[PDB]
Amino acid sequence: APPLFDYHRIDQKLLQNIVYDALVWSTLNCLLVGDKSVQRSGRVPGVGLVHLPLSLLPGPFPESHWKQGCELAPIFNELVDRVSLDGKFLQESLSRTKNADEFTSRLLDIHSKMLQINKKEDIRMGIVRSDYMIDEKTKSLLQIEMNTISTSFALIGCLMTGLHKSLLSQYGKFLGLNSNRVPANNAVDQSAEALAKAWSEYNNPRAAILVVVQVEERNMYEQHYISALLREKHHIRSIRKTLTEIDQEGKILPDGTLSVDGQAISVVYFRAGYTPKDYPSESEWRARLLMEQSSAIKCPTISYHLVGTKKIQQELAKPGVLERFVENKDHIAKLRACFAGLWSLEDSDIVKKAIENPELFVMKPQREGGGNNIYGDELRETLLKEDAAYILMQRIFPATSPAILVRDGNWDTGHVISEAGIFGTYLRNKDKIIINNESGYMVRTKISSSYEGGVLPGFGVVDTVYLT
Amino acid sequence: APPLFDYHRIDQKLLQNIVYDALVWSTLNCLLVGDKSVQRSGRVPGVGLVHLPLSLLPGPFPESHWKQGCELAPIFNELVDRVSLDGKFLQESLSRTKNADEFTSRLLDIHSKMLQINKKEDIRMGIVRSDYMIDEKTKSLLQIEMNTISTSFALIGCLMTGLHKSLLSQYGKFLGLNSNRVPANNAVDQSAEALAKAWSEYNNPRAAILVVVQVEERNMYEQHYISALLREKHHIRSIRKTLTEIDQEGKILPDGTLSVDGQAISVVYFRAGYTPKDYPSESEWRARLLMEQSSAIKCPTISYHLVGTKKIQQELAKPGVLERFVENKDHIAKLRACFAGLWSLEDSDIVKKAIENPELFVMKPQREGGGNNIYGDELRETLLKLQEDAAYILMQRIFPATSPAILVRDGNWDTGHVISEAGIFGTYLRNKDKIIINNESGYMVRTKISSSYEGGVLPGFGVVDTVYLT
Numbered sequence: 001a002p003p004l005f006d007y008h009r010i011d012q013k014l015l016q017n018i019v020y021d022a023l024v025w026s027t028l029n030c031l032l033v034g035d036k037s038v039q040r041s042g043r044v045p046g047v048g049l050v051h052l053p054l055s056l057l058p059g060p061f062p063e064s065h066w067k068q069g070c071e072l073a074p075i076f077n078e079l080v081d082r083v084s085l086d087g088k089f090l091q092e093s094l095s096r097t098k099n100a101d102e103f104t105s106r107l108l109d110i111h112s113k114m115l116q117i118n119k120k121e122d123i124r125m126g127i128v129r130s131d132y133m134i135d136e137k138t139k140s141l142l143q144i145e146m147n148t149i150s151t152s153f154a155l156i157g158c159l160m161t162g163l164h165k166s167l168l169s170q171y172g173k174f175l176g177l178n179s180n181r182v183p184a185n186n187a188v189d190q191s192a193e194a195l196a197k198a199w200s201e202y203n204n205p206r207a208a209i210l211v212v213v214q215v216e217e218r219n220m221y222e223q224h225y226i227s228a229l230l231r232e233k234h235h236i237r238s239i240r241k242t243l244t245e246i247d248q249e250g251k252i253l254p255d256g257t258l259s260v261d262g263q264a265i266s267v268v269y270f271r272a273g274y275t276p277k278d279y280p281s282e283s284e285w286r287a288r289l290l291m292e293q294s295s296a297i298k299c300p301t302i303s304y305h306l307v308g309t310k311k312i313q314q315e316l317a318k319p320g321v322l323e324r325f326v327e328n329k330d331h332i333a334k335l336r337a338c339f340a341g342l343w344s345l346e347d348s349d350i351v352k353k354a355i356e357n358p359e360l361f362v363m364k365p366q367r368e369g370g371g372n373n374i375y376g377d378e379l380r381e382t383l384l385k386e387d388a389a390y391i392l393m394q395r396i397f398p399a400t401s402p403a404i405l406v407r408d409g410n411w412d413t414g415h416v417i418s419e420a421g422i423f424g425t426y427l428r429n430k431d432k433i434i435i436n437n438e439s440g441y442m443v444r445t446k447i448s449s450s451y452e453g454g455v456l457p458g459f460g461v462v463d464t465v466y467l468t
Numbered sequence: 469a470p471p472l473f474d475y476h477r478i479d480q481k482l483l484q485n486i487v488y489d490a491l492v493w494s495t496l497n498c499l500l501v502g503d504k505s506v507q508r509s510g511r512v513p514g515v516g517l518v519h520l521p522l523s524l525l526p527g528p529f530p531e532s533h534w535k536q537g538c539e540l541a542p543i544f545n546e547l548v549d550r551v552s553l554d555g556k557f558l559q560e561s562l563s564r565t566k567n568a569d570e571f572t573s574r575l576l577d578i579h580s581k582m583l584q585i586n587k588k589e590d591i592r593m594g595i596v597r598s599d600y601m602i603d604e605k606t607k608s609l610l611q612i613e614m615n616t617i618s619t620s621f622a623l624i625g626c627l628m629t630g631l632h633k634s635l636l637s638q639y640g641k642f643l644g645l646n647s648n649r650v651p652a653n654n655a656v657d658q659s660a661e662a663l664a665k666a667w668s669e670y671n672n673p674r675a676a677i678l679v680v681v682q683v684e685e686r687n688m689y690e691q692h693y694i695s696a697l698l699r700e701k702h703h704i705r706s707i708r709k710t711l712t713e714i715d716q717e718g719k720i721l722p723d724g725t726l727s728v729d730g731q732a733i734s735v736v737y738f739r740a741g742y743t744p745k746d747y748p749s750e751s752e753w754r755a756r757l758l759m760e761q762s763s764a765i766k767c768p769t770i771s772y773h774l775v776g777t778k779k780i781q782q783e784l785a786k787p788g789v790l791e792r793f794v795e796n797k798d799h800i801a802k803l804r805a806c807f808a809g810l811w812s813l814e815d816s817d818i819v820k821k822a823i824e825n826p827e828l829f830v831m832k833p834q835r836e837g838g839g840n841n842i843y844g845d846e847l848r849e850t851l852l853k854l855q856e857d858a859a860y861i862l863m864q865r866i867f868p869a870t871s872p873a874i875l876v877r878d879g880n881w882d883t884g885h886v887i888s889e890a891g892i893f894g895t896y897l898r899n900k901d902k903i904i905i906n907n908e909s910g911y912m913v914r915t916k917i918s919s920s921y922e923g924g925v926l927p928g929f930g931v932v933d934t935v936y937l938t
């Protein structure tokens with residue numbers, strides 16, 4: 001239980017060596033993104049590159065809680081898939097959301113359409129991430145959110161694991177630390193392997209994988225690495241297109257097959273379409289609908305996408321609704337165990353409790369990708385003064401840890417909290433479940449008191465964990 | 469040879485795809501250097517990164533000439549070692565140079581010192597690069613220069629092989645091009661292997677490899693990659709120090725063992741000290757002498773360094789001079805075949821001939837590593853003011869056949885018509901009379917606009933490439 005070496009007390013010249021070695025590792029192993037300060041770095045590969053904002057050395061996370069997260073991965077895969085099949089559940093839970101939130105209404109309209117066409121679909125898959133904080137008071141592993149769409153950092157997470165293991169190999173003796181207590185990580189390989197197996201189930205060897213990307217994508221290297229895996233290891237072609245280009249170059253062939261710029265597609269992997277910002281026009285919504293109407297295997301489908309909304313995570317947490325969707329009683333227990341307080345803005349008991357104690361609460365709109373949440377002051381002010389746009393959640397307060405934060409080649413000391421993202425990969429075919437796996441991790445670390453922790457936004461860093 | 473697809477005639481859209489793919493590959497695989505426009509990028513790893521200026525698709529090079537270069541690698545390895553053993557030849561050849569060139573004179577003083585000491589060292593190594601152009605009129609592979617010290621681009625050359633192989637696999641069908649005609653390239657792995665095996669010959673498992681580096685090094689990643697290989701694959705520690713840090717933290721232990729900052733060193737690998745710019749003060753000269761006096765295996769030693777001066781390359785080319793150093797008559801013929809016209813400035817048939825026809829000639833001072841030489845107008849002017857000339861040699865200007873290139877530089881591409889220069893690495897390691905490594909070890913290619921005097925890749929004049937065997 002003796003805590004870990006305090007990372008603010010390392011000799012300055014020892015520390016300068018660790019930092020330099022991290023920067024070098026990062027560069028050799030493409031722990032890199034486009035730098036936000038170099039105008040074309042989110043368009044033109046090869047230019048204006050910078051290492052990922054990172055945490056030099058892992059913070060502690062207990063092995064018991066790591067095991068709880070691991071175990072929950074195939075459980076949440078299953079849950080997501082079971083809730084996605086209840087189209088009525090989704091449409092009803094989101095019924096008032098629909099009127100407060102025009103983005104969610106748009107998502108809903110594509111889903112209603114799919115409902116009203118009722119195709120026999122039986123292959124259909126997930127690449128998801130369940131993200132957790134350990135609340136200090138309670139000492140419990142709690143889910144922050146479920147990410148069912150364009151989950152990031154499978155390669156970043158696995159390259160962080162490489163980095164921490166290489167720094168601990170070299171420097172571990174001086175610190176009380178062993179590389180083998182940073183969990184093994186296969187996330188990027190697992191991600192490509194799910195895409196390959198899905199492509200294999202559709203079973204047309206001349207089809208390709210369509211990757212749907214954003215117009216600016218500083219984190220493009222991670223998507224290029226997955227396509228390089230598909231190509232080199234799995235021998236499967238990828239093509240990358242924005243939703244605009246899919247509207248422009250896309251059609252459904254008479255046999256129901258998606259073709260884009262003349263290339264048949266059997267799998268559509270989304271690295272985009274999770275924000276209203278990806279839908280400047282009707283052009284992008286048409287592309288989205290066009291692909292949903294295809295026999296291409298979507299990752300994810302519109303129903304999966306809806307499952308990942310914060311409004312559904314809230315509904316699921318209501319008394320006996322988990323039990324509509326799971327019958328394994330040991331799983332309901334495990335699930336129930338990682339749920340934090342979650343409430344609709346119609347539970348006005350808890351709205352009172354929140355206006356009164358805004359530091360104790362998070363307020364989340366139906367969005368993905370950070371920015372968006374509301375805390376403390378701005379939360380009371382918003383709550384006083386469209387309620388179906390929000391949920392309310394119990395504020396979680398992990399135990400802080402000393403960190404060295406490396407950001408643009410410079411390091412500082414801070415006191416942080418981390419958030420462990422446990423990837424799940426899932427594939428089935430009929431009744432036949434082909435992949436239902438915990439598939440590695442990522443962890444996001446931020447200054448303990450910062451509201452936002454988005455890495456690419458400048459608020460957070462990537463990390464690993466050191467098992468305790 | 470069936471001519472290669474003309475790379476200026478590719479459709480705009482196909483071509484934009486190939487460029488985009490090349491930029492993406494370069495990133496994933498650390499074909500990257502610090503960007504000269506970002507002030508910190510030659511000292512702070514991780515920041516201000518940019519892909520290497522590159523040629524998108526390889527130019528033709530005949531397999532016959534590629535074979536010649538290959539062959540000649542263990543030949544030159546042997547030559548350079550045999551010439552380095554003749555301390556008299558080196559000192560005598562450079563005797564006029566000494567007075568014309570303060571940098572060469574300092575190199576000579578260290579070597580003079582090691583001649584007196586006369587310590588007998590049975591373990592010698594080299595990691596070197598012989599660079600060639602095929603002169604068009606006469607279809608002959610001719611050596612531009614011999615590089616015996618801090619030869620760059622073993623990692624860049626192999627990654628360029630990887631890039632062109634990957635672009636040809638995807639796009640070769642559209643172009644009539646096959647990835648297999650880009651030769652296989654193991655140059656960085658061979659580099660690390662020669663360093664590990666030398667470290668093994670010295671045979672002290674707690675000793676490290678000292679890498680001597682420059683204060684600003686935008687091409688640092690290639691050094692980092694070799695030390696990563698040494699650590700991960702060969703389990704050998706490296707430390708990196710500039711010459712001034714070696715003078716500040718280095719000493720010879722009573723047993724003759726170099727120790728730097730408390731760490732015993734059994735191998736010294738130079739990525740620096742081949743330019744006067746690396747010696748701002750007596751610190752760096754003292755560091756250089758300190759290391760030479762040590763028992764550590766130098767890569768290279770002071771004698772190998774001298775061998776690689778353009779004066780010796782010119783001396784070796786003098787009739788019967790080679791014949792002192794090579795016994796094998798088939799090797800003398802091979803060697804003499806790649807020698808271009810080479811002349812001391814004391815030959816004034818050739819000084820007149822050069823002054824009338826300066827475009828036919830290159831003038832080279834005793835430097836390494838870029839942007840040093842003199843051609844056409846500046847050559848006739850410098851040659852006419854010389855009536856200390858010991859600083860220069862004169863060489864036949866070689867004119868390869870040009871090829872269409874796409875040149876990719878900071879994320880933008882342009883057409884140009886280029887020439888290439890094939891650098892064939894050799895690795896060499898002996899212990900007494902036992903030759904442990906004497907190998908052709910991969911390659912690099914430097915390509916430049918046909919008419920540019922300079923073709924330094926990092927200085928912004930040249931691009932890296934491969935060759936397509938035809």
Ligand SMILES: Nc1ncnc2c1ncn2[C@@H]1O[C@H](COP(=O)(O)OP(=O)(O)O)[C@@H](O)[C@H]1O
Pocket residue numbers: 131133144145340362364367368369370371372373393394395396397419446451452453
């Ligand atoms: N219940 C909570 N307690 C503490 N912090 C939270 C909680 N919910 C969200 N956050 C903070 O907000 C970030 C963004 O919230 P999240 O629910 O994960 O939304 P998004 O889809 O935008 O990533 C989290 O990574 C965390 O730093």
Ligand SMILES: Nc1ncnc2c1ncn2[C@@H]1O[C@H](COP(=O)(O)OP(=O)(O)O)[C@@H](O)[C@H]1O
Pocket residue numbers: 599601612613808830832835836837838839840841863864865866867889916921922923
């Ligand atoms: N004999 C020659 N004919 C044609 N160009 C040459 C010749 N010698 C040198 N050059 C050009 O000048 C560059 C620098 O010359 P080199 O002899 O290689 O010196 P350095 O040690 O500085 O690299 C070469 O790469 C080539 O582009």
Ligand SMILES: N[C@H](CCC(=O)N[C@@H](CS)C(=O)NCCC(=O)O)C(=O)O
Pocket residue numbers: 129147149150151152153214217219220271272274368369370444453454455456460
């Ligand atoms: N444009 C898209 C970026 C997508 C994105 O940010 N996505 C969310 C779920 S949407 C995410 O899952 N993870 C990591 C973010 C952090 O911690 O800072 C891409 O590259 O994927």
Ligand SMILES: N[C@H](CCC(=O)N[C@@H](CS)C(=O)NCCC(=O)O)C(=O)O
Pocket residue numbers: 029155158159160161162163185186187188189
């Ligand atoms: N080539 C990789 C390397 C080995 C690995 O286990 N993990 C990789 C991929 S996630 C990693 O992310 N980081 C370490 C990077 C390295 O040093 O090559 C593989 O075989 O998967």
Ligand SMILES: N[C@H](CCC(=O)N[C@@H](CS)C(=O)NCCC(=O)O)C(=O)O
Pocket residue numbers: 597615617618619620621682685687739740742836837838914923924925926927930
């Ligand atoms: N500090 C050094 C740079 C050393 C260097 O340029 N060296 C010469 C022999 S000295 C060379 O062999 N090659 C290719 C150079 C170009 O075209 O930019 C490094 O080690 O990278």
Ligand SMILES: N[C@H](CCC(=O)N[C@@H](CS)C(=O)NCCC(=O)O)C(=O)O
Pocket residue numbers: 497623626627629630631652653654655656657
């Ligand atoms: N293979 C992918 C692509 C990267 C690559 O080409 N690397 C080169 C640089 S040497 C390489 O070592 N090639 C084979 C080595 C040899 O033949 O000796 C990767 O490295 O992950």
Ligand SMILES: [Mg+2]
Pocket residue numbers: 131145369370
């Ligand atoms: Mg989140």
Ligand SMILES: [Mg+2]
Pocket residue numbers: 145146147367368369370
């Ligand atoms: Mg999210």
Ligand SMILES: [Mg+2]
Pocket residue numbers: 599613837
């Ligand atoms: Mg040269």
Ligand SMILES: [Mg+2]
Pocket residue numbers: 613614615616776777778836
């Ligand atoms: Mg030379």
Ligand SMILES: [Mg+2]
Pocket residue numbers: 613614615835836837
């Ligand atoms: Mg040279």
